[PDB]
Amino acid sequence: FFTYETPKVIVVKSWTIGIINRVVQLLIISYFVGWVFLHEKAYQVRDTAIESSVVTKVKGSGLYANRVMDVSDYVTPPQGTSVFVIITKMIVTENQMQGFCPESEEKYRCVSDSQCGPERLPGGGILTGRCVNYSSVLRTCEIQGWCPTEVDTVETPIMMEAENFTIFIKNSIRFPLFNFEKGNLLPNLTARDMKTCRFHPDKDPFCPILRVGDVVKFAGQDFAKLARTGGVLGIKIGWVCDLDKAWDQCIPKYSFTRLDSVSEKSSVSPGYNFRFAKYYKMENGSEYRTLLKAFGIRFDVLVYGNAGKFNIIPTIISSVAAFTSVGVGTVLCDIILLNFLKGADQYKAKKFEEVNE
Amino acid sequence: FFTYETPKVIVVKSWTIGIINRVVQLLIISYFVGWVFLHEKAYQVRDTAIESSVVTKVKGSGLYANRVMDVSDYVTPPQGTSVFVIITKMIVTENQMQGFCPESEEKYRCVSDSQCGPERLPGGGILTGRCVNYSSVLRTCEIQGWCPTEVDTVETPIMMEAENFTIFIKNSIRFPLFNFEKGNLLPNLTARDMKTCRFHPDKDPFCPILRVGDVVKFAGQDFAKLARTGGVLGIKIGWVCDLDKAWDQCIPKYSFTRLDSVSEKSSVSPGYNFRFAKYYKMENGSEYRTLLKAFGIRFDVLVYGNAGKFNIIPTIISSVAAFTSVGVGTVLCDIILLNFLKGADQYKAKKFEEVNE
Amino acid sequence: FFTYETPKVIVVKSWTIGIINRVVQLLIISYFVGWVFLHEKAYQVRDTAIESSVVTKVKGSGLYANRVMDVSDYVTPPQGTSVFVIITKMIVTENQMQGFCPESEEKYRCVSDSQCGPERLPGGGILTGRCVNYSSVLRTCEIQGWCPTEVDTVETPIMMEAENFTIFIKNSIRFPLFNFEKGNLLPNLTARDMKTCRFHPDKDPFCPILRVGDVVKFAGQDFAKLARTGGVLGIKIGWVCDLDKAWDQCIPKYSFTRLDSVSEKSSVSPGYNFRFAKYYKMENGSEYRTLLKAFGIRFDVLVYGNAGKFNIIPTIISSVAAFTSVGVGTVLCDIILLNFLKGADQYKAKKFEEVNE
Ligand SMILES: Nc1ncnc2c1ncn2[C@@H]1O[C@H](COP(=O)(O)OP(=O)(O)OP(=O)(O)O)[C@@H](O)[C@H]1O
Ligand SMILES: Nc1ncnc2c1ncn2[C@@H]1O[C@H](COP(=O)(O)OP(=O)(O)OP(=O)(O)O)[C@@H](O)[C@H]1O
Ligand SMILES: Nc1ncnc2c1ncn2[C@@H]1O[C@H](COP(=O)(O)OP(=O)(O)OP(=O)(O)O)[C@@H](O)[C@H]1O
Ligand SMILES: OC[C@H]1O[C@H](O[C@H]2[C@H](O)[C@@H](O)[C@@H](O)O[C@@H]2CO)[C@H](O)[C@@H](O)[C@@H]1O
Ligand SMILES: OC[C@H]1O[C@H](O[C@H]2[C@H](O)[C@@H](O)[C@@H](O)O[C@@H]2CO)[C@H](O)[C@@H](O)[C@@H]1O
Ligand SMILES: OC[C@H]1O[C@H](O[C@H]2[C@H](O)[C@@H](O)[C@@H](O)O[C@@H]2CO)[C@H](O)[C@@H](O)[C@@H]1O
Ligand SMILES: OC[C@H]1O[C@H](O[C@H]2[C@H](O)[C@@H](O)[C@@H](O)O[C@@H]2CO)[C@H](O)[C@@H](O)[C@@H]1O
Ligand SMILES: OC[C@H]1O[C@H](O[C@H]2[C@H](O)[C@@H](O)[C@@H](O)O[C@@H]2CO)[C@H](O)[C@@H](O)[C@@H]1O
Ligand SMILES: OC[C@H]1O[C@H](O[C@H]2[C@H](O)[C@@H](O)[C@@H](O)O[C@@H]2CO)[C@H](O)[C@@H](O)[C@@H]1O
Ligand SMILES: *[C@@H]1O[C@H](CO)[C@@H](O)[C@H](O)[C@H]1NC(C)=O
Ligand SMILES: *[C@@H]1O[C@H](CO)[C@@H](O)[C@H](O)[C@H]1NC(C)=O
Ligand SMILES: *[C@@H]1O[C@H](CO)[C@@H](O)[C@H](O)[C@H]1NC(C)=O
Ligand SMILES: *[C@@H]1O[C@H](CO)[C@@H](O)[C@H](O)[C@H]1NC(C)=O
Ligand SMILES: *[C@@H]1O[C@H](CO)[C@@H](O)[C@H](O)[C@H]1NC(C)=O
Ligand SMILES: *[C@@H]1O[C@H](CO)[C@@H](O)[C@H](O)[C@H]1NC(C)=O
Ligand SMILES: *[C@@H]1O[C@H](CO)[C@@H](O)[C@H](O)[C@H]1NC(C)=O
Ligand SMILES: *[C@@H]1O[C@H](CO)[C@@H](O)[C@H](O)[C@H]1NC(C)=O
Ligand SMILES: [Ca+2]
Ligand SMILES: [Ca+2]
Ligand SMILES: [Ca+2]
């Protein structure tokens, strides 16, 4: 039987419960309108799956170890991806060749060939088992491998000029949910600007050229100390864009931070370095290498975003949930009505028809 | 007191509101079955935390600068991860040595040693302060650094053979939520296939070997132009899997796009190039290097996914939300019934027991 | 008119339906406290958008090709990022020069110059078009390019010592929504610890030093085979932290996996290798190179996390959803009461005030 049910309903008309209920309903409606609808923008579809493309190029020349270093010297790796290192300090061990020689760390002091056993395996090469004089004052165990051993201990200068190097970032982003593409280079960017522009969060925040020194500052770091220990900075690019607004309002927000934080909270491992070697060999077959311990700033360009564009389906479901939520005030209004007019017995009786068996 | 409450209810039996309510219920149920259940597949749990692995290897040989280039010559970096560059064009500066020489861009034209001060510090090397004859017609400032300076400007040919190179991808994906692992190399991949296979959207869509020219075509690019300016292409690998279906129906979908989008939309920064150097030294200790300004196509293999497998809890909560939603027709049924039969007063009186105090 | 509506309600008092409904309500409340509140911890805000930075440094020395290899030889690339390779096996093709020579894979068998045409376009250098003796028994096609050609096929040893190398990880993580930073190096780590500590999932899970052999074991991989074939293992670092709990309880979880899973289930692509060359050139201008086909284990240090901390708004809306959901038992209690008490007619009559017209 095609029959429509609906509840029998009391309809109190107290001025008190009337105004207090209407106020609770106003609060529910205004909360839903201002927060869930305007602020949390539930009337639109969101895309968080952003597609990004980063190309980098470092520029500047510097003095180090009586050489002029350009980008090809101090940038590692070279292909201009979203992570690169600018080397600020180098510990060179020139012309290592495969052979025999003693370690240089005091960690390996010896007087007898018997002390040189399978105890201290890492580092350099493999122990020959002998104990040999490294200097007039010290004897250490002898090893086979790249000779001479590097000294990890005496401090070298840092490349101050690196502070005035420039990082050019070229970022392309695409929101597929809205098939919307844009990049951090606006069409009114000129060659002349590129030649002279200066990124600053306030003074010029759209300039693709970033002074290393500026970035180090924005992250609150002392170039002098960071360049000595090495470390990692993040240049974050955020694209939070409401596509319901104007196309030219989808704009890049740059942020600057140091990522290897644990390092400062550590006296044991204070920075970021790595070791690699330049490989040569003579007209004789013999090979030799230049070993560099490289200290520098790693830069991660970090691109995130999320975009919203209005759609009818989310709006519809949000308004339906809104209407279904206007009802929830009834329980509080029940409590007020049934316990705050002295004649509560009247209302409990009016509303509740007891039964028993 | 162990008491069960339930409201007093009108139970109208008008044929009109009866059938209109039953039809509204049929529509709510059919939306929930067709949309929320079949389409949006709400009966299963979804996992997007996919685990992926990309291993790459390039093949091909070409003529450039009267040499045969193999992969080790044109692929950078070499380790065959999900991002790599295939170099298509090169502007070379042979045998740079550390020294003194004049700059070569007209950007540094001078007549006086006084123009060459500490003002235009980046690029090439460091100004020595003199102004030097660069050619019989031109004077530019002298610098200390890698000499001679690179000439940026004469356009060089591209490596046409690069079009016919092959990119081999090896992708492993794993869904931890369902402990389901699979890769883009289907168990029916044979050696003979590998020897001749052919990625093609139609003819061989599971061939792990992709022609560069193909991929460039697929991104809607002209190899000539891309090989001239450089760029970044994305090879996307999708694992959209309905695990309720067959294990052998979990299949990879290849899709092709150019990620450095801003570049064609820009007159200032039109492609992708980078600079790196081959470091040598004479039998004498003397160092010399080959400076390469490298133009090429960047490929990043992009693996995303989501799989769903049925679970009981999503079905339970969706059916619970269904029943809690079946009522929602009542507000519309109320307005129609309670305001469109002229004798609406009957229903108001039967339903509404007014009160006053 | 500020008027409050509310439904009229039956109020059964049967002991039976009283306890059965009260039990259903107890079960809903206990589930909501135990599941949605204790387990799924809905009283707190979650952030998964963790920012992470990894720096690695590999250590150990080993014998390969009758040389001692240190980190600068076998780790690639060298900058100490979240992905690196420890090379375990090498197939070297020494002193290659650009020239003419026949191929060395049997894939290029020939007897006549007519077989070597533009027919088999890929691979090696360019076919010179002639057919030349490769061996006393076999003839292959001649190519222009780096000579002699590499033979991929003769089996070489592995660097057994690689098993005993050590990977040092330094991970910095940041939950930005709660602006909480920490690292995997706890402040009570000493130099002495670093010198001798030993990572173990149970005994010392905070030692940042992981023996490669251990990592290979933990991923359920056999060093000998992984080192022969090459492969990819994942080192995942998880930060599951309840900030409501103790601060020194935000702790990293190590997990070990092989990511290139497709490799073992496949007869086509069994490991991980790549090729690169050491570049030299004579005192004559002419270049010659050492070609290495490099086999090793790739390492991805994989950092995920999510933190939850109590907030009032999630607690409020969960308690609200709890109370609004407690009602749902009424439908089942209706069916039970109105059809399983013999006096169902009493309640049908009490509750339902029919209408007809
Ligand atoms: N770090 C940087 N500092 C200043 N300008 C830069 C930097 N990187 C790139 N540019 C400039 O931005 C413009 C576009 O960069 P791009 O490298 O794509 O062009 P290019 O002609 O290859 O550059 P270049 O010839 O200067 O190496 C160029 O004019 C270049 O001079
Ligand atoms: N793979 C490893 N195995 C054991 N200890 C290591 C390893 N890597 C680093 N350490 C220890 O932790 C310390 C911090 O390393 P970091 O690279 O930050 O600086 P470093 O002193 O130049 O390293 P090293 O002296 O090993 O070259 C190191 O000095 C070293 O003693
Ligand atoms: N870019 C490519 N084009 C064509 N074939 C490829 C390519 N990459 C790999 N292959 C083939 O796929 C197989 C899997 O590659 P894998 O590197 O695992 O083996 P491999 O022995 O090192 O290959 P090869 O030595 O022949 O390059 C190889 O036998 C190789 O022939
Ligand atoms: O998911 C958490 C929630 O946080 C933010 O909301 C804040 C709000 O910004 C503040 O004004 C504060 O007073 O109230 C909220 C605390 O929960 C975001 O605005 C919101 O989008 C985000 O979801
Ligand atoms: O592109 C025009 C655009 O108009 C509408 O945009 C509105 C939007 O609804 C509001 O949120 C506001 O912030 O911006 C506009 C009104 O000033 C719609 O987004 C859409 O129909 C259309 O694309
Ligand atoms: O809630 C957003 C919604 O977006 C998409 O829904 C599509 C639907 O799939 C199309 O068939 C179209 O006709 O209607 C909607 C308009 O976007 C997603 O399919 C879905 O996952 C998501 O719920
Ligand atoms: O193939 C065995 C498989 O059977 C079941 O899968 C069903 C699935 O649940 C249904 O949605 C239906 O549409 O397709 C499948 C039948 O092919 C279960 O998943 C399980 O028993 C098992 O995995
Ligand atoms: O169902 C997805 C679910 O997985 C986990 O929940 C578990 C729960 O932890 C166990 O106690 C079990 O008995 O019930 C569920 C079945 O897996 C996750 O904890 C949870 O986040 C997720 O929703
Ligand atoms: O200690 C400050 C911290 O207190 C709160 O954490 C509580 C938590 O809610 C309780 O469940 C209890 O078990 O642990 C803590 C009490 O010591 C909040 O997390 C937060 O307001 C505050 O930071
Ligand atoms: C940066 O350049 C300015 C002007 O060329 C100079 O005064 C300053 O010393 C430079 N910074 C460093 C760290 O050398
Ligand atoms: C280019 O136009 C945009 C659009 O509003 C504007 O923000 C910007 O200032 C313009 N470019 C420059 C260099 O001022
Ligand atoms: C190779 O010749 C050089 C001299 O140019 C010499 O230093 C080196 O010791 C020779 N190699 C061997 C193994 O003797
Ligand atoms: C690419 O290969 C096709 C056939 O495989 C050939 O016709 C074409 O000439 C090749 N392109 C180049 C630049 O060699
Ligand atoms: C391999 O299997 C896929 C589906 O799993 C099928 O489409 C394809 O035809 C198969 N290839 C061969 C050579 O049978
Ligand atoms: C690795 O070290 C262990 C114990 O220190 C030793 O037993 C084993 O022989 C070593 N293996 C190699 C290849 O050096
Ligand atoms: C350092 O503290 C952590 C946690 O507070 C603890 O697990 C570890 O045992 C401590 N270190 C030592 C050397 O005991
Ligand atoms: C360069 O010199 C080497 C020997 O030093 C010789 O083998 C080679 O053929 C020469 N080539 C040219 C082009 O001079
Ligand atoms: Ca040391
Ligand atoms: Ca230029
Ligand atoms: Ca081969």
DSSP string, C225-272: HHHHH-EEEEEEEEEEEETTS-GGG--EEEEEEES-GGGTT-SS--S-
Residues of chain C positioned with their CB less than 8 A from the CB of B7: 7-10, 351
Phi, psi (rounded to 5 degrees) for C240: -95, 105
Close Cβ partners of A314 (under 8 Å, ≥ 6 residues apart): A42, A43, A44, A45
Best probe of the A interface among B23, B268, B301, by most A CBs < 10 A, is B268
Same domain, C224 and C252: yes
Phi, psi (rounded to 5 degrees) for C27: -65, -40
Q: Which of C7, C18, C8 is nearest to C337 (CA)?
A: C18
How do the residues of chain C divide into helix, strand and coil, expressed in percent and rounded to 5? 25, 40, 35
Residue A143 and residue A103 in contact, taking contact as beta carbons nearer than 8 Å: yes
Cβ burial of C25 (10 Å; 0-12, 13-18, 19+) is: middle
Same domain, B202 and B156: yes
Q: Whose CA is nearest to atom 15 of ligand 8?
A: B313
How far, CA to CA in Å, does A249 sit from each of A40, A181, A182, A246, A307? 19, 13, 11, 5, 12
How far, CA to CA in Å, does A241 sit from each of A29, A181, C217? 27, 12, 47
Measured in residues, chain A has a length of 357
Residue spans of alpha helices (H) in A51-101? 71-74
Phi, psi (rounded to 5 degrees) for C139: -115, 140
Close Cβ partners of B353 (under 8 Å, ≥ 6 residues apart): A8, A9, A10, A11, A350, C8
CA–chain centroid gap for A98, Å, is 42
Scan for tokens 């130099």, then name that residue. Answer: C191
Q: How many CB atoms lie within 10 A of CB B265?
A: 14
**Closest CB to B9 among A5, A171, A194:** A5
Domain with C294, as residue range(s), is: 45-309
Phi, psi (rounded to 5 degrees) for A153: -105, -40
How far, CA to CA in Å, does C283 sit from each of B96, B148, B311? 15, 20, 71
CA–chain centroid gap for B23, Å, is 46
Interface of C with A in 138-197 (CB under 8 A): 164, 166, 170-172, 174, 181-185, 187, 189-191, 194
**C170 touches ligand 2 (CB under 6 Å):** no
Scan for tokens 């020959």, then name that residue. Answer: A128
Scan for tokens 């007093």, then name that residue. Answer: B8
Same domain, B127 and B148: yes
Q: How many CB atoms lie within 10 A of CB B121?
A: 16
Specify the DSSP class assigned to residue C155: -
Interface of B with C in 198-227 (CB under 8 A): none
Q: How far apart are CA B166 and CA B154, in angstroms?
A: 30
Strand partners, B242: B308
- Taking only Cα atoms into account, the Rg of chain A, rounded to an integer number of angstroms, comes to 35
- What six digits make up the tokens of C221? 């991989």
Q: Which of C318, C314, C280, C274 is nearest to C294 (CA)?
A: C274
Same domain, A182 and A257: yes
Q: How many CA atoms lie within 13 A of C175 on its CB side?
A: 21
Max Cα separation, chain C?
A: 112
The residue type at C356: N
* Among A120, A121, A126, residue to substitute to test ligand 15 (most atoms within 8 Å of Cβ): A121
How many domains are there within chain A?
2
Prior bond of C77 cis (ω within 30°): yes
Same domain, C30 and C154: no
Same domain, A245 and A178: yes
Same domain, B171 and B227: yes
Residue A297 and residue A233 in contact, taking contact as beta carbons nearer than 8 Å: yes
Q: How far apart are CA B233 and CA B88, in angstroms?
A: 14
Q: How far apart are CA B298 and CA B303, in angstroms?
A: 16
Max Cα separation, chain B?
A: 112
Q: How far apart are CA B35 and CA A180, in angstroms?
A: 27
Angle between helices C312-326 and C15-31 (to 10 degrees): 160
Q: How far apart are CA A322 and CA A33, in angstroms?
A: 9
Scan for tokens 């168990």, then name that residue. Answer: B187
Query: Where residue B120 sits, what CATH number does that domain have?
Result: 2.60.490.10
Same domain, A178 and A301: yes
DSSP string, B231-260: EEEEEEEEEEEETTS-GGG---EEEEEES-
Q: Which of A278, A279, A260, A280 is nearest to A270 (CA)?
A: A260
Residue A111 and residue A139 in contact, taking contact as beta carbons nearer than 8 Å: yes
Scan for tokens 């196309």, then name that residue. Answer: A247
Residue C82, SS3 per DSSP: coil
Q: Which of B31, B26, B333, B20 is nearest to A316 (CA)?
A: B31
CB-CB under 8 Å, A18 with C61: no
Same domain, A49 and A35: no
Residue C58, SS3 per DSSP: strand
Residue A170 and residue A208 in contact, taking contact as beta carbons nearer than 8 Å: yes
DSSP string, B81-108: -SEEEEEEEEEEEEEEEEEEEE--SGGG
> Can you give the resolution of this entry in Å?
3.3
Q: How far apart are CA B314 and CA C321, in angstroms?
A: 18
Q: In sequence order, what E strands does chain C have?
A: 4-7, 9-11, 44-47, 51-59, 62-64, 67-69, 75-76, 83-102, 126-133, 139-147, 166-175, 180-183, 209-211, 231-242, 252-258, 273-281, 287-310, 352-354
Phi, psi (rounded to 5 degrees) for A116: -95, 80
- What six digits make up the tokens of C304? 């995920």
Q: Which of B265, B266, B240 is nearest to B253 (CA)?
A: B240
Residues of chain A positioned with their CB less than 8 A from the CB of C187: 265-266
Q: Which of C193, C222, C223 is nearest to C209 (CA)?
A: C193
Close Cβ partners of C2 (under 8 Å, ≥ 6 residues apart): A15, A18, A19, A21, A22
Residues of chain B positioned with their CB less than 8 A from the CB of C19: 2
CB-CB under 8 Å, A11 with B352: yes
CA–chain centroid gap for B198, Å, is 23
Q: How far apart are CA C79 and CA A54, in angstroms?
A: 19
Close Cβ partners of B62 (under 8 Å, ≥ 6 residues apart): B68, B69, B74, B159, B160, B161, B162, B165
Residue C135, SS3 per DSSP: coil
How far, CA to CA in Å, does A269 sit from each of B9, B190, B230, C186? 75, 50, 40, 11
Distance A193 CA to ligand 11 centre (A): 12
Specify the DSSP class assigned to residue C324: H
* Among A178, A313, A318, residue to substitute to test ligand 6 (most atoms within 8 Å of Cβ): A313
Q: How far apart are CA A306 and CA A92, in angstroms?
A: 46
Residue A77 and residue B274 in contact, taking contact as beta carbons nearer than 8 Å: no
- Sort strands A287-310 and A231-242 into parallel, antiparallel or unpaired: parallel
Q: How far apart are CA C141 and CA C244, in angstroms?
A: 72
At residue C40's C-alpha, the angle toward residues C34 and C42, to 5°, is 95
Terminal-residue alpha carbon distance, chain B = 30
- Sort strands B273-281 and B287-310 into parallel, antiparallel or unpaired: antiparallel
Residue A165 and residue A62 in contact, taking contact as beta carbons nearer than 8 Å: yes
Cβ burial of A21 (10 Å; 0-12, 13-18, 19+) is: buried
Same domain, A296 and A318: no
Q: How far apart are CA B311 and CA B331, in angstroms?
A: 34
Specify the DSSP class assigned to residue A219: T
Strand partners, A83: A300
Best probe of the B interface among A11, A15, A55, by most B CBs < 10 A, is A55
Q: How far apart are CA B110 and CA B217, in angstroms?
A: 47
Q: How many CB atoms lie within 10 A of CB B125?
A: 24
Interface of C with B in 110-129 (CB under 8 A): 121-126
- What six digits make up the tokens of A224? 């002098």
Q: Which of C58, C50, C52 is nearest to C74 (CA)?
A: C58
At residue B3's C-alpha, the angle toward residues A355 and B7, to 5°, is 65
Same domain, B174 and B75: yes
The residue type at A87: I
Close Cβ partners of B216 (under 8 Å, ≥ 6 residues apart): B163, B222, B223, B226, B233, B297
Residue C82 and residue C94 in contact, taking contact as beta carbons nearer than 8 Å: no
Q: Which of C184, C112, C97, C186 is nearest to C148 (CA)?
A: C97
- Sort strands C231-242 and C209-211 into parallel, antiparallel or unpaired: unpaired
**A282 touches ligand 12 (CB under 6 Å):** yes
How far, CA to CA in Å, does C38 sit from each of B316, C239, C253, C281, C312? 21, 20, 22, 69, 15
Same domain, C102 and C68: yes
Cβ burial of B89 (10 Å; 0-12, 13-18, 19+) is: buried
Phi, psi (rounded to 5 degrees) for C168: -100, 125
Q: Which method, experimentally, gave rise to this model?
A: X-ray
- What six digits make up the tokens of A281? 């060999």
Q: Which of A281, A292, A304 is nearest to A76 (CA)?
A: A292
Q: How many CA atoms lie within 13 A of C147 on its CB side?
A: 14
The residue type at C229: T
